[model samples]
Target: PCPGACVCYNEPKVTTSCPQQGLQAVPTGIPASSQRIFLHGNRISHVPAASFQSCRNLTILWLHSNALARIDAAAFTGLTLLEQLDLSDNAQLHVVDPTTFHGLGHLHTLHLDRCGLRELGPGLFRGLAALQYLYLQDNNLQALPDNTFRDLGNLTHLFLHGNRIPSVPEHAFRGLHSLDRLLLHQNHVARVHPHAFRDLGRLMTLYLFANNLSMLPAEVLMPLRSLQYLRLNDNPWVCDCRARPLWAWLQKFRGSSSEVPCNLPQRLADRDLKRLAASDLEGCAPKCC
Candidate 1:
């Protein structure tokens, strides 16, 4: 039997829509066979324990654009078959604890964008081993702590753009070997530790544009040899003797046609890095140790 506010509209797949329905909590009686649930744009405040306890076969859940501020530890304990979870656009969500997604092991796509999340603690994504596409952009994440995403080995597309991250710590992406597209653009990242991407060999496209990077070492690009599109424009690149390895590396790489403008040095400013002569970048002291 369908609930009062929600109705089974798409009978073939057993879909229900209570979106913008002014729901205060999960409705009384949504049928057990329901595969998709649209609960976005509601006034729901918190997700109590076993709120969807009856819907174990649910494959899709949309709860974004709501007034959700708190979520119970095992709120999604029964939905192992769920593939996509849309929890983005919640302005009141700040921090999500480790056990919030306890039993969602088969979840594939997780969206946490625009939630004002300040920190991601350990074991926060421990059970989500099968997650493929994760969107964490437009938040207040200041740093990606070590081993933060160790269990997401199957994740392909990781979007961390539009945040306040200052640097990409080593081991931040420790177990993501299958990742292909990574977007780290539009942050305040100024330092990329050496060997930051020592294990990501399968990455194909990288976006590092619109950041505070001064000089990106050649070793960062060495691990991503298979990368076809490398966007590094709009950064404050310090073109000096320190940039020799990057210049030499970019000269030989067959990819990347983006304009890398020099920021410092009186003469090199506004000049395209790849177009400048090697002799012009030769006079500074040997600083490599």
Candidate 2:
């Protein structure tokens, strides 16, 4: 029995799908036993403090495609049993207080894509110890703070593409031990510190395409023996003797495999190392010749 203008129905144990319902905030007085609440495609500007105070058993909270600009500090206070939270497609969302997700301990997945987040505050994810999949792509982030991901020990898949990050600090990703796939492509990365990805022993796929990188430093990637697919195309690579080290490393590791393509000058772009062995571009150092 929501208000006159609101739509409420109960047939199969109370499921609410309020898409484009002109909601300004979380609707009040829905049944406490409601398991799934879909509030997508609305004009909700702010999540009221204690919005889920009574919804203790809420499993999925889909607030995507909203006009939400900010989430209050106690927005998710009583959702102790919540598992999946989708806050994607909200382009104006900027500030997420560190205390906003204080009581969501059982949360597993968090989707915050295209939220216009410029930076993440430290300890913002301190309560979500069980979070596994974190999607923070298509934002305006430049860099993550050191030890920013220390509490998420169970994180497996980290999506960080389409941002403005130019470099990865050595200790920025400190405690992501369970990380398997790290997507860092479609950004403005120029340099990767040698120890930037040191302790991620389980990392397998690393995407570094469409960036501003000129060379791949061996010290930066030598530690990741578990890496299988490495995408390094569409970058302004400087091909010369400075690249010989990379060529030699690739040749030694690419045993019996096809040659890796190099985007060099017009005369050398499509040629393989074996084909360019005797050419002047082969031994000339980067920017030296």
**Which candidate comes out best when scored by TM-score?**
1
lDDT of 2 by residue, 184-205 (tens): 9899999887788887878888
- Give lDDT tens digits, candidate 1, residues 168-221: 988887888999999999999998887888778999888888999988888888
Candidate 2 least-lDDT 10 residues? 252-261
- Give the least accurate 10-residue stretch of model 1, judged by summed lDDT: 280-289
After superposition on all C-alphas, the RMSD of every candidate to the true structure, in Å, is: 1.7, 3.3
**Model 1: lDDT to the true structure:** 0.85
Top-scoring candidate (lDDT) = 1
Model 2 pairs whose backbones collide = none
In model 1, which runs have C-alpha deviations exceeding 4 angstroms?
Answer: 284-289
